[PDB]
């Protein structure tokens, strides 16, 4: 009781969900005219909306050091590199 009402679970965001979260978080910010945000999200393996937020803030910070209102695709991919630094470190790959 108090939990038998529902056991709704959170699926980790798919690539298109991550695209949607990118749109939500980047509507507020300013960036360049052209960007393939769908591919940008798909480049991120799995991850989550927290990671989408991290990518958005990393793109903002990277555009800060250049001091321009138009976040370029190169800065965006540098932000995608925030999905990195986790990887699997050593190639355990034992499965």
């Amino acid at each position: 009781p108090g939990r038998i009402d529902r056991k709704i679970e959170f699926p980790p965001p798919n690539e298109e969900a991550r695209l949607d979260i990118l749109k939500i978080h980047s509507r507020k910010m300013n960036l360049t005219r052209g960007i393939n945000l769908r591919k940008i999200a798909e480049l991120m393996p799995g991850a989550s909306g927290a990671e989408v937020k991290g990518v958005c803030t990393e793109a903002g910070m990277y555009a800060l050091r250049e001091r321009r209102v138009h976040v370029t695709q190169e800065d965006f991919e540098m932000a995608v590199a925030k999905v990195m630094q986790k990887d699997s470190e050593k190639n355990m790959s034992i499965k």
């Binding site: 690539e15 799995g46 790959s93």
Partner: protein
């Protein structure tokens, strides 16, 4: 006091060690086998695709284990290697003894017997690996089998064993049709379900490894579909997707 392993029951009566290993088999690895008339095929997901490899082993998941069958592991590679070696040894020992290729069911029963022994007696870890087998024999023709670390194998005809195995098998159930199934449409179904279970759309032919077993004139041919053929399959699937999406 000395450390003793856990090959025991539960107060309820469950072998929770074996159950944990079987569930961990779902974690990591992704393979699926689809059985069809005149050809049965395996699809595997290339987990690590770092650009610094060379792909000289020619096969990581799919293993040729006999003239008339081929398996695919989804477990810890350490156990997978020894299990494949034992499987080939068993098949070849049968070939020596009976001068006849070993039936797939007998081969799978031998392997699952060895895994059952490993989970049964002694202070030995269960073999944390679950593998598929596709094969052809004289008695039952094309056969597909799935063995879990519990040693309780099952004779399947369309199954998956990987991480999103639930999603893959749901897709297979939705778009699987027996009898009508043929080799080419089986390939289309396999690539479609792999695209579904691998989040990144437009799967590169490098991230997917697939091998088809076919019956030529009195001889079993197990061909691992190479990069060009795989990506041509991908292109045909892409044409089908675009057509179906646009026609609405």
């Amino acid at each position: 006091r000395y450390d003793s392993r856990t090959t025991i029951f539960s107060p309820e009566g469950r072998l929770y060690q074996v159950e944990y290993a079987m569930e961990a088999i779902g974690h990591a690895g992704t393979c699926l086998g689809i059985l069809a008339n005149d050809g049965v095929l395996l699809a595997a997901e290339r987990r690590n695709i770092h650009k610094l490899l060379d792909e000289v082993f020619f096969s990581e998941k799919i293993y040729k284990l006999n003239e008339d069958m081929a398996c695919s592991v989804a477990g810890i590679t350490s156990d997978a290697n020894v299990l494949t070696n034992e499987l080939r040894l068993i098949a070849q020992r049968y070939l020596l003894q009976y001068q006849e290729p070993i039936p797939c069911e007998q081969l799978v029963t031998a392997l699952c017997d060895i895994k059952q022994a490993y989970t049964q007696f002694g202070g030995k870890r269960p073999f944390g690996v679950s593998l598929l087998y596709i094969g052809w024999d004289k008695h039952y023709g094309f056969q597909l089998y799935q063995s879990d670390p519990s040693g309780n194998y099952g004779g399947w005809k369309a199954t998956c064993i990987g991480n999103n195995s639930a999603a893959a098998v749901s897709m297979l159930k939705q778009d699987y049709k027996e009898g009508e199934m043929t080799l080419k449409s089986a390939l289309a179904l396999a690539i479609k379900v792999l695209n579904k279970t691998m989040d990144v759309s437009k799967l590169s032919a490098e991230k997917v490894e697939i091998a088809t077993l076919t019956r030529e004139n009195g001889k079993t041919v197990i061909r691992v579909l190479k990069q060009k053929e795989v990506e041509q399959l991908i292109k045909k699937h892409e044409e089908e997707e675009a057509k179906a999406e646009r026609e609405k």
